[PDB]
Design a protein around this ligand. Structure first.
Ligand code: SF4
Ligand SMILES: [Cl-]
Ligand SMILES: [Cl-]
Ligand SMILES: [Cl-]
Ligand SMILES: [N+]
Length: 304
């Protein structure tokens, strides 16, 4: 035939030529999800990054996630297709916040959401994600923990563990999940009265209280078998992921306008260019990386 390769075919060929794997987050565009080798939540992506046989990891996600993969694979090439793929919640937490909390509470473990910079993780005793934060905090040997950046996840952790949670910083949150209100809950239940509600713990507490299940996107996938019809209170591309996994169920976005600009910095074109040009190479300074790796490997040990 006369036709040549499209972007998908170019990517497939370059993945072979580079001995590369494409890891994608659940909030990636559908056409990016469709070319990824593995798709998951933050914990699943971290765990998957400990069994990489490929030489090159193309990370269809935000920079903190790519940095986590690099911390776990210092001697592989990790590529981020755009350096503008970044997380507003993670940027809210600075070293100065951690140091001030450690001064007040020197005996409190420092528990940092993976939505955090590599520099911040160097100060964590253990990292967490939305999937394992309750379990990890429960098991730590202290009734007081320093926790951040996300204050809404911190609220959920405090509720479920009964422990004293010292937030760092004071107001960390995700603007995507802050879009959900009690009015969205009322509207969803009126439009879909037989559906149950899957709610991310980055949503505000009063919205969390309306959930049938509170879960990371990975937990949403794991527990979707419990009902046939769900309203999805997270970033709207998760609806595509759930529909692909469970074509026989029904999924509805809680809000179509719950979009993460940083996630959508990743495009099919810039994944192609990432493999073609071997860019942008993610690097983490050795001293930071070694300290962060200790905290991440502790997380993986404490949460299977
Ligand atoms: S959805 Fe929220 S927490 Fe996740 S990368 Fe985007 S801004 Fe960060
Ligand atoms: Cl692999
Ligand atoms: Cl996220
Ligand atoms: Cl199934
Ligand atoms: N102890």
């Amino acid at each position: 035939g006369s036709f040549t390769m499209d972007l998908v075919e170019e990517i497939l060929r370059l993945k072979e030529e580079r001995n590369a794997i494409i890891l994608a987050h659940n909030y990636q565009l559908p056409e990016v999800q469709d070319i990824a080798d593995f798709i998951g939540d933050s914990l699943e992506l971290a765990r998957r990054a400990t069994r990489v046989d490929a030489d090159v990891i193309v990370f269809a996600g935000v920079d903190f996630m790519a940095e986590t993969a690099k911390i776990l694979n210092p001697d592989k090439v990790v590529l981020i297709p755009s350096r503008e793929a970044t997380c507003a919640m993670a940027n809210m937490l600075k070293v100065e916040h951690i140091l001030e909390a450690k001064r007040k509470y020197p005996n409190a473990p420092v528990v940092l959401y993976v939505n955090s910079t590599a520099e911040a993780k160097a100060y964590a005793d253990v990292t967490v994600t939305s999937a394992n934060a309750v379990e990890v905090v429960k098991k730590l040997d202290s009734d007081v923990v320093i926790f951040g950046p996300d204050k809404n996840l911190a609220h959920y952790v405090a509720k479920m563990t009964g422990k004293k949670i010292i937030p760092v910083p004071s107001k960390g949150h995700c603007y995507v999940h802050q879009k959900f209100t009690l009015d969205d809950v009322e509207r969803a239940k009126k439009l879909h009265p037989n559906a149950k509600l899957m709610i991310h713990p980055e949503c505000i507490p009063e919205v969390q209280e309306k959930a049938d299940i509170i879960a990371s996107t990975g937990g949403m996938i794991k527990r979707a078998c419990e009902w046939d019809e769900w309203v999805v209170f997270t970033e709207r591309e998760m609806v595509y992921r759930l529909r692909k996994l469970y074509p026989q169920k029904k999924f509805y976005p809680a809000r179509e306008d719950a979009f993460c600009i940083g996630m959508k910095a990743i495009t099919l074109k810039n994944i192609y260019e990432s493999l073609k040009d071997m860019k942008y190479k993610v690097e983490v300074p050795e001293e930071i990386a070694r300290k962060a790796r200790k905290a991440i490997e502790r997380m993986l040990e404490m949460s299977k």
